[PDB]
Amino acid sequence: HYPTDDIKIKEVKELLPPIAHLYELPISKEASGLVHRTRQEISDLVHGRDKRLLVIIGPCSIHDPKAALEYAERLLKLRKQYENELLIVMRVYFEKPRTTVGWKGLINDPHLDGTFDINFGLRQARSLLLSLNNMGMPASTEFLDMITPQYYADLISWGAIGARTTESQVHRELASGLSCPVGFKNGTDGNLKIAIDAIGAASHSHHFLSVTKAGHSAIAHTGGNPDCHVILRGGKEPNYDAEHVSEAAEQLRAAGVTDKLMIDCSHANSRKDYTRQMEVAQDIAAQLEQDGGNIMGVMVESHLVEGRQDKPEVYGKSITDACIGWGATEELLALLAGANKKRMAR
Amino acid sequence: HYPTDDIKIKEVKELLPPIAHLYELPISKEASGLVHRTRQEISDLVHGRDKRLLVIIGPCSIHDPKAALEYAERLLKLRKQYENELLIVMRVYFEKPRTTVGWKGLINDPHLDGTFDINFGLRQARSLLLSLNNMGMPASTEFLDMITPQYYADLISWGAIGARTTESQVHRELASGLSCPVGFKNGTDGNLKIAIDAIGAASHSHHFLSVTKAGHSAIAHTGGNPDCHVILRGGKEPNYDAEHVSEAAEQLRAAGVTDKLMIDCSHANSRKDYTRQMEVAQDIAAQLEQDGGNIMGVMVESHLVEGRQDKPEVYGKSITDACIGWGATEELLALLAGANKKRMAR
Numbered sequence A, B: 001h002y003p004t005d006d007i008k009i010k011e012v013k014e015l016l017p018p019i020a021h022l023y024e025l026p027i028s029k030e031a032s033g034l035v036h037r038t039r040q041e042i043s044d045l046v047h048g049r050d051k052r053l054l055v056i057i058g059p060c061s062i063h064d065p066k067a068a069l070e071y072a073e074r075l076l077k078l079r080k081q082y083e084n085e086l087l088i089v090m091r092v093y094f095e096k097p098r099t100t101v102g103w104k105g106l107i108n109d110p111h112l113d114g115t116f117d118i119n120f121g122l123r124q125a126r127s128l129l130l131s132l133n134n135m136g137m138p139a140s141t142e143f144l145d146m147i148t149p150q151y152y153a154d155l156i157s158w159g160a161i162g163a164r165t166t167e168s169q170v171h172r173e174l175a176s177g178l179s180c181p182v183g184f185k186n187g188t189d190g191n192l193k194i195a196i197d198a199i200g201a202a203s204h205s206h207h208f209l210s211v212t213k214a215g216h217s218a219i220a221h222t223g224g225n226p227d228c229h230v231i232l233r234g235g236k237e238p239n240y241d242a243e244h245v246s247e248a249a250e251q252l253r254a255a256g257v258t259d260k261l262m263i264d265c266s267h268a269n270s271r272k273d274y275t276r277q278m279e280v281a282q283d284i285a286a287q288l289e290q291d292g293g294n295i296m297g298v299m300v301e302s303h304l305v306e307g308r309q310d311k312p313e314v315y316g317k318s319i320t321d322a323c324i325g326w327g328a329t330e331e332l333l334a335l336l337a338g339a340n341k342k343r344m345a346r
């Protein structure tokens, strides 16, 4: 009798179920009001009901809950100051997907040492998200799989499906059942169609496999997500400018989906140079001053300290993509608030 | 207290765990030997140690186990007849991923009527796979998610990650732990790099979330999969010809991964026209006669009856992509067998 099962598996280890973390860290009354309201505010932006700019801003990845909370405290002041022009939501992404060998993020490997203490990682992810909402800072994240949302999606005000998963049927099915609005990124080489197609798909009811909150194999039946939009994040060429926004809006309309979209200032639009994010934001500011009617949001990679590092030596400095630092963050946000004030007054 | 959990979920229903199906339908000694042997035979083709041609052939999707078994019985005679030139493995894909609304396949919706009887679908998929292997026909399939493999991957001799999921980090992580060899398709717009990158990534150890055989939330830690290869399946233009093969092989060598590849005769290489699969097969046959050193396999969509239908009225006729019929299948296999006999004698 020859073996055929789990030939290339080292082990399969059962995790604590979502309900265990939910019981210790239940969503508070206050956090629930913030999440519910922020989801609605974002829906309003996606559908053109409000002309504030959604700003998804924060670290490329979270590797240190302390620095994340300090960052949130600073950002909250600006979220409040600019609340009439900008809707500021913090980036709380636990991982950056990659092709080469590297750190697999705070959920999978919280101790940053290849121990893969995932129960600890999931608990800390949830705890950080609860603390953020409790202080008044809504949180955004990317869902890379169909199981992690059960642990903490209740704390998430906006979700992303990245460039590498926007075309994936199962990630579209997930999005169709996410409680938050969802942005779909264009493809890594610039393909917009996959994201336009994703919005249409995700608006419908789907099924996908996952686990129940008690941790048991399950099929989820979704209602459809009416609050999806595209995210322009560059490709072979950047796609942040007015001509690209116009072309995207035309294609969105031709597909019968929302022509309000988000522009990522980072990643392929900055050509991985954090100092380009301000130049992208300047371009967006000019678009908002002139017309800019199809822009509902921007994404920015921002941390306490600018740049990046291979090892987590400097506090508040990214170990994944390079970020703008705090002073630049202040200037970028001022810029976009000033420009959108003018758009909103028209 | 505002609601924030499962806002856009109709229901999340617990499934029977993998172990329930495994208990009723354990892999037999005979099936286990066939799977183990066929996996090794394929590895030898991936790594150029044998020059038979892997032929992944059969329906686009399985919607009727009876027709599938009848198909397998006819195909088995040709698998044996051509065993010195070809390694024939049946296509046993339960679903066609799609953007628009439609049937979600035999696992998700076995009764072909929107009832989504997934426990019955999983049981029927496993039962069919066990029956196939027991009759001496190995099976191939596409894994669309990270949970279905626990139900029946032990019965699969070759697995696909399709064009829409090749770039997905989690599907690459899955691949790195699949017991079978795995083919990664180039992107829907012809992008080959995502598949070359996938081979590299899948060769390493990874973690991903799934369920245990007992059905509980789990983390799987993989050992890496050394038996991955690319599948040329077209883009905007077909990519099956000798120039395209040569360019792909060159790219594969540069990345330091296997330069033996598979060519899909269907989907975008046929320009979605089932009557053009034979043209692609004839082109491949000519490459094999001249040189064709980098070709280790082909994929063909084939059924009892040619064409497609929207409703499952005609027995043995596809309700997803159109397939060549049985007569044309005999012709196509004869052609490839004849051509590869000459390549192997060189």
Ligand SMILES: N[C@@H](Cc1ccccc1)C(=O)O
Binding pocket: A146, A147, A149, A150, A153, A154, A177, A178, A179, A180, A210, A211, A220, B004, B005, B006, B007, B009, B012
């Ligand atoms: N609980 C998730 C939706 C979901 C359900 C089941 C599995 C996965 C995701 C949400 O509220 O967004």
Ligand SMILES: N[C@@H](Cc1ccccc1)C(=O)O
Binding pocket: A004, A005, A006, A007, A009, A012, B146, B147, B149, B150, B153, B154, B177, B178, B179, B180, B210, B211, B220
């Ligand atoms: N059981 C699968 C591997 C796997 C394990 C766990 C989860 C998903 C897939 C195989 O033998 O190929």
Ligand SMILES: [Cl-]
Binding pocket: A142, A160, A161, A162, A185
């Ligand atoms: Cl993102």
Ligand SMILES: [Cl-]
Binding pocket: A162, A163, A185, A233, A267, A268
């Ligand atoms: Cl990106």
Ligand SMILES: [Cl-]
Binding pocket: B142, B160, B161, B162, B185
């Ligand atoms: Cl395939």
Ligand SMILES: [Cl-]
Binding pocket: A099, B167, B193, B194, B197, B198
């Ligand atoms: Cl890649």
Ligand SMILES: [Cl-]
Binding pocket: A012, B211, B212, B213, B214
């Ligand atoms: Cl297990």
Ligand SMILES: [Cl-]
Binding pocket: B162, B163, B185, B233, B267, B268
């Ligand atoms: Cl395909």
Ligand SMILES: [Mn+2]
Binding pocket: A060, A061, A096, A267, A301, A320, A321
């Ligand atoms: Mn980043």
Ligand SMILES: [Mn+2]
Binding pocket: B060, B061, B096, B267, B301, B320, B321
């Ligand atoms: Mn098909």
